[PDB]
Design a binder for this molecule. Structure first.
Ligand SMILES: O=C(O)CSc1nc(Cl)cc(Nc2cccc(OCCc3ccccc3)c2)n1
Length: 276
């Protein structure tokens, strides 16, 4: 039932629209991240953080293009890294919000529904896109100017040693699906337009957009992945997986909130966590 008809031409036009918007919204694509990770890039190598010495050298070398005040710098290494992650998460929320506004029909939704979809959506999208920046050894940071090792992150004192490991475990399995940016543009759109998010006023309009994104995604995967007939079904399970990874992350933050009372959680992230 794969046919070239006006319906399929419209679904290919939607896929290209989303790809083009995704390129504009997300500075470091998966294509450029893989080229850095394999060394295939002509770019200067990222600075590698693999121990305490290289962490402190990296803090001098990596132009984080972000102000960490004296009171934050005074914090121990684990809290500095965690506060860095929190800062990047807030930036990612901004990028994902600009991408969502490019999804046809999204800006026409009630502004409260746009905020709800983004509130419940953004962490699922952050873990999806973080996989693009990961291999089994570590994760690219600071728009690919740095690379932090998986074992260096595991070595941070409890509870900080556990926060990234679940994202690496998700990423190694997700990356084995070999999605490209063209696939991910549509996958992320599908997740954002989830009609079962709590406190949505107008469900039917979101479901109607999502159904069309799901058709565009299924057609993209069939064209772009002749090596697998399972990939669409496998991505539907990744969507359900992501909700449980976010649950787990929120529970970790609660432990951090209770047992590390000193520490400062970003007020914008606190708002999002309120009802996850
Ligand atoms: O890509 C990003 O920038 C955010 S994502 C991310 N992920 C990890 Cl695992 C660490 C990190 N920030 C960081 C990594 C080293 C050290 C560190 O220390 C505080 C930042 C800082 C900035 C300037 C001078 C000194 C310290 C923070 N950021």
């Amino acid at each position: 039932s794969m046919q070239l008809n006006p319906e399929s031409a419209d679904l290919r036009a939607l896929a290209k629209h989303l790809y083009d918007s995704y390129i504009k919204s997300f500075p470091l694509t998966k294509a450029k991240a893989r080229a850095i990770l394999t060394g295939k890039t002509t770019d200067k190598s990222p600075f590698v953080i693999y121990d305490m010495n290289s962490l402190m050298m990296g803090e001098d070398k990596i132009k984080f293009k972000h102000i960490t005040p004296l009171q934050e710098q005074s914090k121990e290494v684990a809290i500095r890294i965690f506060q860095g992650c929190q800062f990047r998460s807030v930036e990612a929320v901004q990028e994902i919000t600009e991408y969502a506004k490019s999804i046809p029909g999204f800006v026409n939704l009630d502004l409260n529904d746009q905020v709800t979809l983004l509130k419940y959506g953004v962490h699922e999208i952050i873990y999806t896109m973080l996989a693009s920046l990961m291999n089994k050894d570590g994760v690219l940071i600071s728009e690919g100017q740095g690379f932090m090792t998986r074992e260096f992150l595991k070595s941070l004192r409890k509870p900080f040693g556990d926060f990234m490991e679940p994202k690496f475990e998700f990423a190694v399995k997700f990356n084995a699906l070999e999605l490209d940016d063209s696939d991910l543009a549509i996958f992320i759109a599908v997740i954002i337009l989830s009609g079962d998010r709590p406190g949505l006023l107008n469900v039917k309009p979101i479901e109607d957009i999502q159904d069309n994104l799901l058709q565009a995604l299924e057609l993209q995967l069939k064209l772009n992945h002749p090596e697998s007939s399972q990939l669409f079904a496998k991505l539907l399970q990744k969507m359900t997986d992501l909700r449980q990874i976010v649950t787990e992350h929120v529970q970790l933050l609660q432990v951090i909130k209770k047992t590390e009372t000193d520490m400062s959680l970003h007020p914008l992230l606190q708002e999002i966590y309120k009802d996850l």
